[PDB]
């Protein structure tokens, strides 16, 4: 038998340096994870014991801290360069910055292959992209080779910015004619590497013939085997084991997000290129794995020009931006409209006739705001500043929620009304009156929404059995501040850009802000 | 005696293509008027006749037409050259694009003298700009001299954007010392040339000892001894007879605006520098004056830039703009948010500790939205698309209003609702609700409007005895669509930018525009 080890990341998101246990900035040292450095270290431990090795990434490297704001692809192509992937499929926020932000930094300075099986191109695009992404490549490896197909969204025009050049075409439909015609060229070992989430990679799995295991991301899905080694929750056993089509067992992996974990997956394979085992399991980075040294100095040579970075003026505001707890968790405050603003124009997707926008909405809860931005620094606003108002490390996620569970939410916004509790919402896209003489779960009593299946903006009452796009943060998404009904509810959940970055965005490109308290939020 | 002809233009505004009778663009050539052609071959005609002439402009050639917006003031060098113009004095819309936008393209293409004599600078700014204009000039006319001193609005801080860089001291506090130095330098012919409008005029005229005629502007007032030759109805005589504090008789003249008059003035001056006589009248510069044709051709030739950029995107909407009289006639519509919104941002100026903006406030009768903006080309807007939206060639207005006269307006704006009239308010900085079931004159049930001495902006209600700015069209503030009260009451009036140069230079900025129509005017 022939033993392969995949070694695979997934959604590392601009996670660089190491960070604290829930993948935000890095406080003590002595207990952080992850990280680019301490990666390195693990994977040349693996290839000193291993003869059989694959680092393989299934997207998502781009967006998530300052790393990819001040250095955009530029920070991926190097430091993936230097840990030596041997291949990355395309993931949604690859698109972030357009084809063009794709191109150059990424495409054109990495030393593996960059794989799509269901992305085409048309027009002067088709010309100058050709051959810059592939739908696999075959990677020799040892004695024997492996094919590895790539695969990518097909909702990544909601998710990112890829232009009006690109299709995303359904993941099973493109990858089949890849897979038949890889066995035509006698590669009998094939690895489905892709960025449409654990439900799409099981149907991958279950239905693309010849596919001998699935290796993928976007849904920051856990999977482990044993007693989980941190505060991740498994959501199945590493691997996932599906039952294909053909009757053979296939296993399907992802490893979380943020570079915390490393994928670990060892497969046996016969000389037909036959699973015949498969174990493993996700490796936790934590502090008892050194960084490496050199991979730590050339981060820390890097991370000058981001400090210098995080004092620039971003734009300015001729209001005081007020973030304090005692308006934003009481009433309406200009800095959660502010924000909630930047989140709904950082969610503006391609142009089509049934929608002026595919999403109007956004809630924001009141304790996710932690500071104030005085305007008499001359009006400016910098990134440190932003960081203060944002200092969780999260994102401004895409849900969708029936109107049912939206009430619910609102109605936790005001159900202990008066304590100072991190729930009440800040809003855009909604006008809601609360009445707090009626009881607790009965106080909305007017919500209305804007349209988005109208080519003229407008307000009309909320729906309960309509399904609601909205953004939020992720720790809303997750349940957090008692929104459990969100979590237990929500109907899709797609990650979006780090919190801070939509908001500096925002202010890079209106130069001068000045949010008012209009009355989105009414007591009565 | 010696004669002297004063020649006087004033608020010409960009209209450098002869106009309408009302300034607006010119439909029927047989019947225009103004324009830098027929008033070259006018003053041309003046020059062969009359020894001693000066020809001035009093300020405010900048901002009013597709011109300027193009040329961005390189056409009034030119075509003000053209005409050999003797001095100008700055305006507060030589402002417009900055100290930067005025000293290139004006001080360092102008042939003639430039004059201001109480703006003064610090700073780098100071040795970059000295000299470039002047306090005043001495300017030989047949063997004698005339001395001009300059002067422009002290308001301009409030009224365009000079920066922060440049101070606006009291017109006769810095006029009397250099009308003073004139004297001592054998200086005995003073004219007084400048931009703070008629009332200052006057009070220049009364006590700047040693003027000996005052050429006005900025209030665009129409003087007239006689009946009057077209529409415009005088406020006075011409020239305006000042009785100054030592016992001399002033002259005050101004020659409304739009290049549609030549402001011509006689005096007779003894050998000391008395004057003796003054007598006049401005000059209807209508189409019995033939265009000079070689001006008229070198305007036909600088036109061609002017036609291709009216077709050029200025920015993208994707959402239908909402311009239809069915809408914006009888409710809040989404064209009327967007215009008001233009407003407001065309009029944030220097950040001070007493308030966020000086103006929060728009109304825009509907009446004067002419047209929709679809977004099905694929989101495309053009100065052309504007046009049609803005036809009328006015200017978004800054007034003072007693909240008392603005409680009237919105009663006029619903007096006589259901009928599809012009007077119906879209707002910005306001939100009111009607009760179209009460009595007219009594429908406003609610009136609240933004805030500006505040840091966080935010409505509270209208108070009937404050002073509010408001920005609105030239055609309210002159009472059209029945406002008369607010010609009749409003206690400050200044005029400002171009209509459609508002809206297209907040579109550029705003690069994809989305406004929705969101409560500002609700009906109970
Ligand atoms: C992404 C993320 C978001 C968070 N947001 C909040 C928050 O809004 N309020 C809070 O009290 N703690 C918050 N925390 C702290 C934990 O509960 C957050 C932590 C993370 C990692
Ligand atoms: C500057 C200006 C503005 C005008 N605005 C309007 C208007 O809003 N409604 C109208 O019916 N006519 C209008 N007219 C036509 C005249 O009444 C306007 C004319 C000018 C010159
Ligand atoms: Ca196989
Ligand atoms: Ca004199
Ligand atoms: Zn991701
Ligand atoms: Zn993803
Ligand atoms: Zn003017
Ligand atoms: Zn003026």
Redesign the pocket.
């Known amino acids: 038998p022939w033993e392969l080890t995949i070694l695979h990341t997934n959604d590392v998101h601009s996670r660089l340096e190491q960070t604290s246990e829930?993948?935000?900035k890095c406080v003590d040292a002595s207990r952080c994870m992850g990280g680019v450095a301490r990666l390195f270290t693990k994977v040349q431990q693996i290839r000193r014991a291993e003869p059989n090795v694959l680092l393989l990434d299934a997207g998502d490297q781009y967006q998530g801290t300052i790393w990819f704001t001040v250095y955009k692809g530029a920070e991926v192509a190097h430091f993936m360069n230097a840990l030596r992937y041997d291949a990355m499929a395309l993931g949604n926020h690859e698109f972030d910055n357009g084809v063009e932000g794709l191109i150059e930094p990424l495409l054109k300075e990495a030393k593996f292959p960059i794989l799509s099986a269901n992305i085409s191109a048309s027009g002067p695009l088709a010309s100058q992209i050709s051959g810059l992404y592939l739908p696999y490549k075959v990677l020799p490896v040892g004695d024997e080779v492996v094919g590895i197909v790539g695969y990518t969204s097909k909702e990544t025009p909601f998710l990112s910015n890829p232009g009006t050049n690109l299709v995303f075409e359904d993941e099973i439909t493109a990858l089949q004619p890849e897979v038949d015609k890889l066995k035509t060229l006698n590669v009998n070992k094939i690895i489905a590497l892709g960025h449409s989430g654990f439900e799409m990679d099981k149907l991958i799995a279950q239905k693309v013939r010849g596919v001998d295991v699935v290796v993928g991301g976007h849904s920051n899905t856990f999977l482990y085997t044993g007693n989980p080694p941190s505060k991740e929750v498994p959501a199945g056993k590493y691997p996932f084991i599906v039952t294909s089509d053909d009757g053979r067992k296939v296993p399907v992996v992802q490893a979380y997000a943020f570079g915390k974990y490393l994928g670990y997956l060892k497969i046996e394979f016969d000389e037909r290129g036959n699973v015949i085992s498969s174990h493993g399991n996700p490796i936790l980075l934590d502090s008892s794995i050194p960084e490496d040294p050199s991979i730590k100095a050339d981060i820390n040579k890097w991370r000058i020009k981001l400090d210098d970075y995080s004092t620039q003026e971003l734009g300015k505001t001729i209001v005081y931006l007020d973030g304090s707890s005692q308006s934003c968790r009481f009433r309406e405050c200009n800095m959660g409209n502010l924000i909630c603003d930047a989140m709904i124009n950082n969610n503006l997707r391609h142009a089509d006739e049934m929608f002026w926008n595919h999403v109007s909405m956004c809630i924001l809860?009141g304790?996710?705001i932690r500071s104030p931005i005085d305007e008499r620094n001359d009006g400016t606003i910098t990134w440190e500043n932003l960081a203060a108002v944002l200092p969780?490390?999260?994102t401004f996620d895409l849900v969708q929620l029936k109107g049912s569970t939206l009430k619910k939410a609102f109605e936790h916004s005001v159900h202990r009304y008066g304590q100072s509790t991190?729930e009440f919402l800040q809003v855009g896209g909604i006008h809601v009156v609360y009445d707090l003489s009626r009881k607790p779960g009965d106080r909305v009593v007017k919500l209305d929404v804007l349209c988005t299946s109208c080519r003229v903006p407008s307000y009309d009452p909320l729906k309960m059995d309509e399904v609601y796009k909205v953004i939020l943060?992720?720790?809303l998404a997750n349940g957090?501040?008692g929104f459990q009904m969100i979590k237990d509810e929500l109907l899709r959940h797609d990650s979006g850009d780090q919190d801070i970055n939509v908001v500096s965005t925002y202010i890079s490109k209106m130069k001068v802000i000045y949010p008012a308290v209009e009355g989105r939020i009414k007591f009565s």
Do not use: A, E, L, T
């Open positions: 829930d993948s935000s809860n304790g996710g969780f490390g999260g991190g943060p992720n720790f957090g501040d």
